[PDB]
A paper describes a structure:
Two crystal lattices were observed, an orthorhombic crystal form, and a monoclinic crystal form. Orthorhombic crystals were obtained from MCSG1 B1 (20% w/v PEG 4000, 600 mM NaCl, 100 mM MES/NaOH pH 6.5) and were harvested with reservoir with 20% v/v ethylene glycol, 5 mM ADP/TPP/MgCl2 added as cryo protectant. The orthorhombic crystal form was consistent for all complex structures and was refined for all ligands. In addition, we observed that the product complex (ADP/TPP) has a very similar conformation as the substrate complex.
The same study also identified genes essential for growth on nutrient agar using high-density transposon mutagenesis, and found thiamine monophosphate kinase (ThiL) to be essential. In this study, we present high-resolution crystal structures of ThiL from the pathogen Acinetobacter baumannii (AbThiL) bound to substrate Thiamine monophosphate (TMP) and substrate analog adenylyl-imidodiphosphate (AMPPNP), and bound to its products TPP and adenosine diphosphate (ADP). The AbThiL structures assume the same two domain fold as MfThiL and AaThiLwith an N-terminal A domain and a C-terminal B domain.
Numbering used by the authors:
A (entry chain B): 1 to 304
B (entry chain A): 2 to 305
Amino acid sequence: MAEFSIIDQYFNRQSHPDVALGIGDDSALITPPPNQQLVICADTLVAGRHFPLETSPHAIGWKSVAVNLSDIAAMGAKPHSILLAISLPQVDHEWLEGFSQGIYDCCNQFGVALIGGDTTQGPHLTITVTAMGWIETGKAVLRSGAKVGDYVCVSGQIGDAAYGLQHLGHSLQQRLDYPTPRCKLGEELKGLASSMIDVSDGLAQDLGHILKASKVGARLILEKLPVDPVLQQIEEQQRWQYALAGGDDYELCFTITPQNYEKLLQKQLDVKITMIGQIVEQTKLTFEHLGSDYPLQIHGYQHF
Amino acid sequence: AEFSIIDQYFNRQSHPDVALGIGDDSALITPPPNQQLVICADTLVAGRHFPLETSPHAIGWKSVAVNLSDIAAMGAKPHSILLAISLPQVDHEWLEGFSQGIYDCCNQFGVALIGGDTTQGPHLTITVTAMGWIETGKAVLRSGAKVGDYVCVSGQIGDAAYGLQHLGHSLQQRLDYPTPRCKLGEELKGLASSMIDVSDGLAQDLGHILKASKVGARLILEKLPVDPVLQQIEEQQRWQYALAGGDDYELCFTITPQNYEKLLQKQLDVKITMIGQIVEQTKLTFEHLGSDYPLQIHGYQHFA
Ligand SMILES: Nc1ncnc2c1ncn2[C@@H]1O[C@H](COP(=O)(O)OP(=O)(O)O)[C@@H](O)[C@H]1O
Ligand SMILES: Nc1ncnc2c1ncn2[C@@H]1O[C@H](COP(=O)(O)OP(=O)(O)O)[C@@H](O)[C@H]1O
Ligand SMILES: Cc1ncc(C[n+]2csc(CCOP(=O)(O)OP(=O)(O)O)c2C)c(N)n1
Ligand SMILES: Cc1ncc(C[n+]2csc(CCOP(=O)(O)OP(=O)(O)O)c2C)c(N)n1
Ligand SMILES: [Mg+2]
Ligand SMILES: [Mg+2]
Ligand SMILES: [Mg+2]
Ligand SMILES: [Mg+2]
Ligand SMILES: [Mg+2]
Ligand SMILES: [Mg+2]
Ligand SMILES: [Mg+2]
Ligand SMILES: [Mg+2]
Ligand code: NA
Ligand code: NA
Ligand code: NA
Ligand code: NA
């Protein structure tokens, strides 16, 4: 079984009616919805670096899609379709069946179509997914735009996936293996959030991209960070390391005025929202604990 | 480090046809009116899609070229690319040459680099996503070939496959620096009845058209456009390079006699050769000096 049978056997379910031309030709074709901009991103997952080597093939496929839908959500946009480029050393039916199942389970959960890609042989498992979304023209939430006085907020919990990586077997491994892209929240933040980013590297480092892009600073309250009860029971130091520098969260961190935060809380959401601090004028990220300044040194995930 | 790599090598101005380029979670494109998005992605694996010692400039060039080739194969105009690279080491001399190759190909064809992803991985792997636009409904597909249509191919075929086995020969330039036939693809909109780019080998790639169109073809072996160097080698090897070599990135297309006459009236920037015609019998056969010529051909396939 070779390249072309592989595509047909695992990556060629019937295309959505809303896709002008799916898998089968030199490119895919999409008809843009009217009065909307294309939103596009791509992220690579390297075996043994973005996930443990023994990660289940289903989880590998899920996360490959999930982390890229998360980057669409971080813009306020609605995801539409993906391309899948996979390089793998060996043809393993069992692995490919479970991997394609994770691809399609994530796509199906968020209404996304798989419309093309590329399948190659290479010595190390390497997956690049390109994601495409659409957004009302002009309405994208940027990493710039945060203003002094805006609240700093984050969805869900932070630190779960990082704790899980260090405690494989623990229930919190599910947050490492199966992050949830906050797609509907991202769309609900269109027109409310003044800036936004998804927490892939670590909350402090990813907030920092907003602070640099907006030429502002932020003061965070450590005891308001939303952590899992398990992390609430570990020592404070390691708890805040996990929460602020763990990464792999794929939650949304955003800024928002107090008035728009009240409108956001009136909405029906599928995820917890926590206000964790405020944007300030001084161009520094600082931490507060029990009403006093808390010095804290911290580094997020960077390749190389 | 990762963030310095992007800023130093992959962050040239955006440019004008791009609402939001590099620096956010996704890129933003305002679609031109009355046009469909054309999108594709191809992966290059070091030591497999190019000799390990290929210059970084040629690696960058080809990474873009092979993807513009799949846009050209639809009759579409290329617009922008994303670049996903997994690198074992940070090498500034390599990165300078590679990024220069990326941009030299983009600049030659009016294409913007609007985003991507940079990761560490044990083996050099590059996936470019290419985006183009086509007047709605006017894409040239792999289906559509009709009995009586001529089979044509641009340029020369076999050059790159010869160069790969004769590294150091002048024809290595066609391996290292294929030319995507962008303008020709555009000029075949409304003229070609079907089209594919010849990445795997003319016989196999024409085979994809034959299967999608439910027709066959008869090719005239002495009409195949080969380099003078291949004209001087034994004819069996000549035909294997020409028909199963791959890596040509020429356009193979079908066209009515009537529309072929119109194509010739255009001032084209590449040679065009009529090499045979579509027939009812659903087989690819070869003819040489007026008689059937049996030929066993196997084009490129991963895991084969
Ligand atoms: N893993 C994949 N998932 C989805 N579609 C894929 C995948 N690999 C390839 N494809 C699709 O299968 C078709 C054949 O792929 P390919 O032979 O690589 O095309 P080309 O030779 O034009 O680059 C294309 O339509 C491509 O987008
Ligand atoms: N090699 C590259 N070429 C072009 N753009 C790139 C490349 N690598 C990353 N980018 C861009 O740099 C920015 C930051 O990348 P990254 O930190 O990986 O984003 P994210 O964490 O949201 O996935 C993005 O805008 C991305 O599109
Ligand atoms: C085996 C293993 N080691 C380490 C990690 C942690 N990790 C890997 S990548 C990463 C950051 C997210 O990946 P990146 O490539 O930076 O994604 P992007 O910012 O492009 O979305 C983290 C915290 C992991 N998930 N698995
Ligand atoms: C070192 C090396 N070995 C072999 C080849 C030949 N080769 C590699 S890939 C390929 C076909 C084109 O690659 P593929 O991944 O199938 O591209 P696609 O069809 O997706 O465009 C050929 C002929 C090469 N260029 N370099
Ligand atoms: Mg092609
Ligand atoms: Mg990224
Ligand atoms: Mg990302
Ligand atoms: Mg391909
Ligand atoms: Mg990152
Ligand atoms: Mg992001
Ligand atoms: Mg291709
Ligand atoms: Mg191929
Ligand atoms: Na990305
Ligand atoms: Na990444
Ligand atoms: Na492709
Ligand atoms: Na390929």
